Structure formats: C-alpha cells, structure tokens
Copies of this chain bind each other. A is one copy, B any other.
Amino acid sequence: VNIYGLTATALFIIIPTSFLLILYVKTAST
C-alpha cells in the first residue's frame, strides 16, 4: 500500500519496456 512499492514497480515495468521498444523500432526501421 506504500507509495514507494507502487512507484518502484511502475518504473521497473515502464523504463525497460521503453528502452526495448526504442531498440526494436530502431532495428525494424533499418
């Protein structure tokens, strides 16, 4: 219920997802 746990989970879900999407889009465009 703590804010720290929820925000850590959200960041861990989102940031690597964004990084992987960046790399995949770069690869697919090339």
Bound CA span A18–B10, Å = 14
Q: How many angstroms from the CA of A7 to the CA of B6 in the assembled complex? A: 9
Size bracket, chain A contacts = 10 to 19
Binding site for B on A (CB under 8 A): 2-3, 6-7, 10-11, 14-15, 18, 21-22, 25-26, 29-30
Indicate which residue in B6, B10, B11, B26 contacts A29 across the interface (CB closer than 8 Å).
B26
* B-chain residues with CB within 8 Å of residue A29 when the two chains form the complex: 25-26, 29-30
Contact of A3 among B2, B11, B18, B30 (CB under 8 A): B2
10 A-B pairs with CB atoms under 8 Å apart are A2-B3, A3-B6, A7-B7, A7-B10, A10-B10, A14-B14, A14-B15, A18-B18, A18-B21, A29-B30
